[PDB]
Design an enzyme around this catalytic site. Structure first.
Site: not given
Ligand SMILES: Nc1ncnc2c1ncn2[C@@H]1O[C@H](COP(=O)(O)OP(=O)(O)O)[C@@H](O)[C@H]1O
Ligand code: VO4
Ligand SMILES: [Mg+2]
Length: 705
Positions: A162, A166, A208, A211-212, A434, A436
């Site tokens: 989170g 991604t 998240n 979440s991926s 990531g 967790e």
């Molecule tokens: N740059 C950003 N701008 C707006 N919201 C963001 C941004 N980065 C993360 N988020 C918010 O946080 C959520 C989780 O981010 P994500 O990239 O899916 O996490 P992860 O690191 O697990 O892949 C996004 O789906 C959105 O709700």
């Molecule tokens: O919550 V993320 O690191 O996409 O799995």
């Molecule tokens: Mg992700």
């Protein structure tokens, strides 16, 4: 020495605070060289106990806005970094900050209007550092170096679940796609690959909402004119148990809910679906809706994206049929007969739909969900299965079908993104699950967290090991920057005597068990490897000291999940499927999940090592998905884990620009005395065994040309 002279009246220092980790305190009276120090707090004063060797961290002078690059900090220490990021985040609403070339990205949990096309082109053609810190700048820099050096690049984003990996990866890909345009529209399709894999590869966890549950490495291919011509996606172990199990407030993969939300649409009626709450595989978490997400509207977008990639309506219906079949499979009633036997009725309404959709015989499926065939040379034995065993066999089949479906979609995306031309260079974008941890951690978290260890190792090897060795071999004066080498925990996991090798050993035993494996872990590692622990109040779990946190793993289900098998009779039935797509999955064309995973990560790490990396370090600022909310304790924990302070130290101390090349471009005793007698600054450039290191001192000579 002069150090004491810096601690004077009117000056401020950082001291430990429970809540904000560090708190400020003003010096009342000047310091005397050599045991205490009187400070005036925000509310009162005290004689702060002090170590004359390691005095309290000096505070930096206030500036209107936090410095864009943390290497600019006069007093470089943890409190300074934590404070500069807090000020840039909470007050200035700045999520991006530089640590040299390394980018720090704070999750805003709020949409920001900073990703538009106008801003993209404002970053294009600019030098790293000219513009405010931004994911686009990292992306531009990689693009700049690829074109100028004809060298492959990698965008490598990191951080816990989170943190925003991604999102960062997608915006980097959007940048590339925009500056490559107008291609003679391949760019749109490369971008389309992300949301498709999100639909079948992402799910809501308590960390998240999106979440991926798989790892992704996307190689973006360029021609000699540095225009995108195609791409190729490599995926890493998908979470299969997600298909048949969710804990409280978690969901299955998104596309199941997109499909169920479309149950009463004409095109979908033949799939005989209901709400996500009807099906055991989607209802388990107790909440089928994600706040802010309209799953029906997402279905429509998913369909558009499939279409954009060239996947027509029939192709889409075919995967939807597989997905619907999996849902119905989960609602097939398995009843107990006595204590030793199970039974499935051939007239089970959900079994009939399952078999209609996949073109199977219901009598055969019902039979072999509740019995198992044992073939020796002397005979063939058929043993009944208990209801628990039958449920497990049933769910294993569901997981297997979904795994094939996911691989199939990825493969077809890769076919759609192929190119006939020659690949001049590529930029690879890495986006994996990531770090967790939950109240209950299992095989899934162990694998994800092991993958994150390996990425931290790849980061460290490049930023700290390889870099500092270059200086030592070139024989210049270099003070070593310490970093935490996570090679030990990695060896504990992957090496010859490691946890995963022991898991594989137990899996070979026909009477292997999770408990026996756990005991072997206890015996081999308790009080012998410091990174391994047994809780005083548990004989079913073990604890690992990861780079980011300690994690407790329950042993239950490790063998099963490592083996990842389906009963032969069930596979044979689906192999004889009258549905073309299903028959293709189970057609006939040893190693465990854990071993396949290790090998996959090894190949990925060496793929990355053969590119010029560009690191983005994502931080989750709070645990409640709140907009611009700064949780100091959790943030400093992440900074430490990623070695952010050490990254800044080596960043500040490193020489950006690196004899034979010196003369021709524009003996070694001559070239040196030439440059020395050319520039009055002897500190502005350091000479080595075979190269001269210029501190932007190298840029001056360029414009003189
Ligand atoms: N740059 C950003 N701008 C707006 N919201 C963001 C941004 N980065 C993360 N988020 C918010 O946080 C959520 C989780 O981010 P994500 O990239 O899916 O996490 P992860 O690191 O697990 O892949 C996004 O789906 C959105 O709700
Ligand atoms: O919550 V993320 O690191 O996409 O799995
Ligand atoms: Mg992700």
């Amino acid at each position: 020495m002069a150090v004491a002279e810096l601690y004077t009246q009117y000056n401020r220092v950082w001291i430990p605070d429970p809540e904000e980790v560090w708190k400020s305190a003003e010096i009342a009276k000047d310091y005397r060289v050599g045991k205490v120090l009187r400070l005036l707090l925000e509310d009162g004063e005290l004689d702060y106990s002090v170590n004359p060797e390691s005095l309290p961290p000096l505070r930096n002078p206030d500036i209107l806005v936090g410095e864009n690059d943390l290497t600019a900090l006069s007093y470089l220490h943890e409190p300074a970094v934590l404070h500069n990021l807090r000020i840039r985040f909470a007050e200035s609403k700045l999520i991006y900050t530089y640590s040299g070339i390394i980018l720090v990205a704070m999750n805003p949990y709020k949409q920001l209007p900073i990703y538009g096309d106008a801003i993209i082109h404002a970053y294009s053609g600019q030098n790293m550092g000219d513009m405010d810190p931004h994911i686009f700048a990292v992306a531009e820099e990689a693009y700049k170096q690829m074109a100028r050096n004809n060298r492959n690049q990698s965008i490598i984003v990191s951080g816990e679940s989170g943190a925003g990996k991604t999102v960062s990866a997608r915006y980097a890909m959007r940048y590339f796609a925009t500056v490559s345009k107008s291609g003679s529209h391949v760019e749109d399709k490369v971008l389309a690959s992300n949301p498709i894999t999100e639909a079948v590869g992402n799910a809501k966890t308590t960390r998240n909402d999106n979440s991926s549950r798989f790892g992704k490495y996307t190689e973006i291919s360029f021609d000699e004119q540095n225009q995108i011509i195609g791409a190729n996606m490599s995926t890493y172990l998908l979470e299969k148990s997600r298909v048949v199990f969710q804990s409280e407030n978690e969901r299955n993969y998104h596309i199941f809910y997109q499909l169920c939300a479309s149950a009463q649409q004409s095109e979908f009626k033949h799939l005989k679906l209901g709400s996500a709450e009807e099906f055991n595989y989607t209802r388990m978490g107790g909440n089928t809706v994600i706040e802010g997400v309209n799953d029906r509207a997402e279905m429509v977008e998913t369909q558009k994206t499939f279409t954009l990639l060239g996947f027509k309506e029939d192709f889409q219906m075919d995967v939807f049929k597989i997905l619907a079949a999996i849902l119905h499979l989960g609602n097939v009633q398995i009843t107990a007969v006595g204590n030793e036997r199970s039974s499935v009725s051939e007239d089970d309404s959900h079994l009939k739909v399952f078999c209609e959709l996949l073109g199977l015989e219901s009598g055969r499926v019902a039979q072999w969900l509740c019995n198992r065939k044992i073939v020796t040379s002397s005979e063939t034995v058929v043993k009944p299965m208990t209801r628990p065993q039958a449920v497990n066999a049933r769910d294993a089949l569901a997981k297997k079908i979904y795994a094939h479906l996911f691989d199939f979609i990825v493969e077809r995306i890769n076919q759609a993104l192929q190119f006939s031309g020659k690949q001049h260079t590529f930029i690879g974008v890495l986006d994996i699950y990531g770090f967790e941890t939950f109240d209950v951690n299992s095989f899934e978290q162990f694998c994800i967290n092991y993958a994150n260890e390996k990425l931290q190792q790849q980061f460290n090897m490049h930023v700290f090991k390889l870099e500092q060795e270059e200086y030592m071999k070139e024989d210049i004066p270099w003070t070593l920057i310490d970093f935490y080498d996570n090679q030990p925990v990695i060896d504990l996991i992957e090496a010859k005597m490691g946890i995963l090798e022991l898991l594989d050993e137990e899996c070979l035993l026909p009477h292997g068990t999770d408990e026996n494996w756990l005991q072997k872990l206890y015996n081999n590692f308790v009080n012998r490897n410091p990174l391994f622990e047994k809780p005083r109040m548990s004989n079913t779990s073990f604890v690992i000291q990861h780079f980011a946190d300690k994690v407790e793993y329950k042993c239950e289900g490790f063998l099963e999940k490592n083996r990842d098998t389906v009963y032969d009779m069930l596979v044979e039935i689906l192999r004889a499927s009258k549905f073309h797509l299903c028959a293709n999955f189970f057609q006939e064309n040893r190693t465990t999940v854990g071993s396949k995973f290790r090998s996959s990560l090894y190949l990925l790490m060496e793929t990355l090592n053969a590119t010029t990396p560009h690191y983005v370090r994502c931080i989750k600022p709070n645990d409640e998905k709140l907009p611009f909310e700064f949780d100091s304790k959790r943030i400093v924990q992440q900074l430490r884990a990623c070695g952010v302070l050490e990254t800044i130290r080596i960043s500040a101390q490193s020489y950006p620009s690196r004899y034979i090349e010196f003369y021709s471009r524009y003996k070694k005793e001559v070239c040196k005395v030439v440059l020395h007698r050319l520039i009055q600054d002897s500190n502005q450039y350091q000479f080595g065994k075979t190269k001269i290191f210029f501190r932007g001192q190298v840029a001056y000579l360029e414009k003189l040309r």
